[PDB]
Swiss-Prot record:
It comes from the Bacteria. Belongs to the Vgb family. InterPro entries: Streptogrm_lyase, Vgb, WD40/YVTN_repeat-like_dom_sf. This is Virginiamycin B lyase. The gene is vgb.
Length: 298
């Protein structure tokens, strides 16, 4: 699989596209941290803007819930946002000041779970807007990305505790120290192999952790790649952003890592998602990238 890369333009330039996800019907949703908005791109390529109600909110991550609503984090404004199916945005303020919400995902029973990077907590909010939080055991852990595991627990990275965290719906928190010292785990996601796969921004590795906590690691070919986010592709593929190297990485068959250069000065790729055919990513340079592999012959 060699490839095709297309860039798409958002409604404005320099909007700071950052998080990205795709609905089951193929609509791409993005956060734009400089423009302070969320955008949806339909299949026909038409863009709908959702400007945040709160100015200077530093919108970071987003997720689409089972009921089709879009939930997101406002990192600077200390808020969780929600876009209803009616297009209406509702914001909920976190109880403790300067909690710095960051990663967000749906839990096993439908609540929305998130990390509070500076607050040093995991939060959970119900459909009715009730917020509940779990303090992490060690100060200054900087919990970052979060995802739902195959074991129905939430798995997250602790960027400054060099650990992968697991929290269950009942509040059991377990931490698994990473073997590479001070490795700076950032993105995490569920692999199709039912393990969790993460990136080490400093360790410069892709990590794999089983639901029982067994870790293996794979060195990224490009030095100082500063990998950020990761997502499952088809089968055992994991696709990741090399924010520092301006590349898209792919861990594939036999754990070979392939790298695809993005052909754009200071691209700074951040979020990444896969819609089944196309790998979509957000670049700080202000465009959305679409990467597609060409099938093999004979
Ligand atoms: Cl839940």
């Amino acid at each position: 699989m060699e490839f095709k890369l297309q860039e798409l333009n958002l409604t404005n330039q320099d909007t700071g596209p950052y998080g990205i996800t795709v609905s089951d019907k193929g609509k791409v949703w993005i956060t734009q941290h400089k423009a302070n908005m969320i955008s949806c791109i339909n299949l026909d390529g038409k863009i709908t803007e959702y400007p945040l109600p709160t100015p200077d909110a530093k919108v970071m991550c987003l997720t689409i819930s089972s009921d089709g609503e879009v939930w997101f984090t406002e990192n600077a404004a200390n808020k969780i946002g929600r876009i209803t199916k009616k297009g209406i945005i509702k914001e909920y303020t976190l109880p403790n000041p300067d909690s710095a919400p960051y990663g967000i995902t749906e839990g096993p029973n439908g609540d929305i779970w998130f990390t509070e990077m500076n607050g040093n907590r995991i939060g959970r909010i119900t459909d009715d807007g009730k917020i509940r939080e779990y303090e992490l055991p060690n100060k200054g852990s900087y919990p970052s990305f979060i995802t739902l595991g195959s074991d129905n627990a939430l798995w997250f990275t602790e960027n400054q505790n060099n650990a992968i965290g697991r929290i269950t719906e009942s509040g059991d928190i377990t931490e698994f120290k990473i073997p590479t010292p001070a490795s700076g785990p950032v993105g995490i996601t569920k692999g199709n192999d039912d393990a969790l796969w993460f990136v080490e921004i400093i360790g410069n590795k892709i990590g794999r952790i089983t639901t029982s906590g067994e870790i293996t690691e794979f060195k990224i070919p490009t030095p100082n790649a500063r990998p950020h986010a990761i997502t499952a592709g088809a089968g055992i593929d994991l696709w990741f952003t090399e924010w520092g190297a301006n590349k898209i990485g792919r861990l594939t068959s036999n754990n070979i890592i392939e790298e695809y250069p993005i052909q754009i000065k200071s691209a700074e790729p951040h979020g990444i998602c896969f819609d089944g055919e196309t790998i979509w990513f957000a670049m700080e340079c202000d465009k959305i990238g679409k990467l597609t592999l060409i099938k093999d012959n004979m």
